[PDB]
Design a binder for this molecule. Structure first.
Ligand SMILES: [Ca+2]
Ligand SMILES: [Ca+2]
Ligand SMILES: [Ca+2]
Ligand SMILES: [Ca+2]
Ligand SMILES: [Ca+2]
Ligand SMILES: [Ca+2]
Ligand SMILES: [Ca+2]
Ligand SMILES: [Ca+2]
Ligand SMILES: [Ca+2]
Ligand SMILES: [Ca+2]
Ligand SMILES: [Cl-]
Ligand SMILES: [Cl-]
Ligand SMILES: [Cl-]
Lengths: 149, 149, 149
């Protein structure tokens, strides 16, 4: 009996695991996730970069990163307003790197940017028309997380 | 080995508890929940107050309750139209109480409200400009639920 | 130990099943599902009919099918643009059938439609009028899935 009860419970667990994965898929679909594309989402809350990283990380996601023009637009329509991107030049000034590793490939800088203005700007925000501006990491901007395709 | 399978089941169950919690957090984030703030949700359906209470309760939430101006604005944005609040003077005419207990403190009544008009009005709806009006609990207004910060 | 732990895990599993069901109810509510009404959802992506079917099937739903004028309007409101319906005459030209099975009990064809125009049209799209037009199953239109009341 015990071996049988255990086997039956293992079957229930597998079913429940599939049901939760279905829940995640239906949720992403309902929130706009496109086939074969990363899922971008925001709660429309503005906060310093460190908080955005902690928040996305707590959801098992990462701060949104545009790898190409298409993703840059996708992020732009989700945010609506100025939002941090998962990019910083904290290591070597002028050398922007993804918070998940690697050198910046695609970029969409606004004219005269990046200018590492004032006391310094090592974070990046996507703003009007999807263009980018480097800004202080301590400034508050919209939190946008990304989840894998 | 019976005990080995049992220990794996325990790990499978704890992994699922953690993943469901992550799924709940992501959904709340996607629906606009701000850090440290309770969040509001609606399906935009209009119904009598008793139905709204029953629906929210079943979801382990309560009819939305504005505790201050920020929350009042957040509920107004979510609702988009007249919606019941978790406030009534059903128990003792004239004394509004939160559905979850306690006397009403912060309020945002329209001029000349509440007035327990006619045969009586024991419920409350947030309306235009976000101001409040006491209304019949039998009237149908938008169902808006709140969930804990 | 063994038998007590086993009985506890059965309760842990049932608790998780109840919690997941609640999570699903909350997600549907936030998605706009109305009491006793089936609900339609979209990620706003446009794709060929075969991909819409594969996508909704994977989410355990079906391609949206209006059964009366109310549901037809509801699908029209969710899609916002042209969207495939779960109706085709792929099996026998001229005979439209629900993907779930059977002959139509309701239709809202635009004048002189369906006409299997040009190279052929075996799928159906609800347009920006609520009216229907048969169109190529290979053309890309908005994916709208349906889930039970
Ligand atoms: Ca620097
Ligand atoms: Ca810099
Ligand atoms: Ca700058
Ligand atoms: Ca009274
Ligand atoms: Ca009077
Ligand atoms: Ca009263
Ligand atoms: Ca009144
Ligand atoms: Ca044909
Ligand atoms: Ca045809
Ligand atoms: Ca046609
Ligand atoms: Cl900085
Ligand atoms: Cl009343
Ligand atoms: Cl076709």
């Amino acid at each position: 009996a015990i071996e049988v009860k255990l086997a039956n419970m293992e079957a229930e667990i597998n079913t429940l695991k599939s049901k939760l994965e279905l829940t995640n898929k239906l949720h992403a679909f309902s929130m706009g996730k496109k086939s074969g594309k990363k899922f971008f989402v925001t709660n429309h809350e503005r906060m310093p970069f460190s908080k955005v990283k902690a928040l996305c990380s707590e959801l098992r996601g990462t701060v949104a990163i545009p790898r190409n023009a298409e993703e840059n637009k996708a992020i732009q329509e989700v945010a609506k307003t100025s939002a941090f991107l998962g990019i910083t030049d904290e290591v070597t000034e002028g050398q922007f790197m993804y918070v998940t590793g690697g050198r910046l490939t695609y970029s969409n800088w606004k004219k005269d940017e990046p200018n590492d203005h004032g006391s310094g700007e090592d974070c990046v925000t996507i703003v009007d028309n999807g263009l980018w501006n480097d800004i202080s990491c301590q400034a508050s901007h919209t939190a946008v997380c990304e989840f894998p395709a």
